[PDB]
Amino acid sequence: AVIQDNTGAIIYNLAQQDMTALRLTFRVGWQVANTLNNDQPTEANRYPAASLIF
Amino acid sequence: AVIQDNTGAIIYNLAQQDMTALRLTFRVGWQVANTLNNDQPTEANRYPAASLIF
């Protein structure tokens, strides 16, 4: 492999420079389901949680 | 792999150009380890070899 920085210039070449590297990956996502309700129907004013702040 | 000129230009691409390469490596080092013999103790004046020059 070869590694590049954001300019597209090469910055390491694992084969020509006698280096090894490890690659990791993971796929996820999340959602909250704050459905319409008889208590507080105006959705902008509901949340299923609260916080303590200073 | 890819092979680079030291300026950062790609010279060869092994996969795209249907080429194979072989890499040889070796790791080594050496030391003279001259001993304190009973004669000529002054280390700066002592060496276990001599040369002919012109």
Side-chain angles (χ1 to χ4, degrees), chain A residues 2 10 13 16, chain B residues 1-19:
Chain A
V2 62
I10 64 190
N13 172 336
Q16 189 169 340
Chain B
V2 302
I3 308 303
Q4 294 163 224
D5 174 285
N6 67 273
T7 58
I10 286 72
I11 296 298
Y12 301 133
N13 179 314
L14 279 285
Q16 189 172 339
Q17 304 181 259
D18 304 315
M19 303 205 301

Side-chain angles (χ1 to χ4, degrees), chain A residues 47 49-54:
Chain A
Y47 213 77
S51 64
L52 284 160
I53 71 158
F54 66 109

Side-chain angles (χ1 to χ4, degrees), chain B:
Chain B
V2 302
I3 308 303
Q4 294 163 224
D5 174 285
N6 67 273
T7 58
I10 286 72
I11 296 298
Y12 301 133
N13 179 314
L14 279 285
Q16 189 172 339
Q17 304 181 259
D18 304 315
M19 303 205 301
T20 290
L22 182 150
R23 190 177 70 187
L24 289 187
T25 190
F26 187 62
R27 287 206 292 155
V28 71
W30 74 277
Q31 184 53 270
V32 54
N34 92 78
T35 295
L36 178 63
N37 56 343
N38 177 267
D39 200 0
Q40 185 42 291
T42 304
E43 196 281 341
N45 295 85
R46 182 176 66 246
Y47 211 82
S51 67
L52 287 159
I53 65 168
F54 67 110

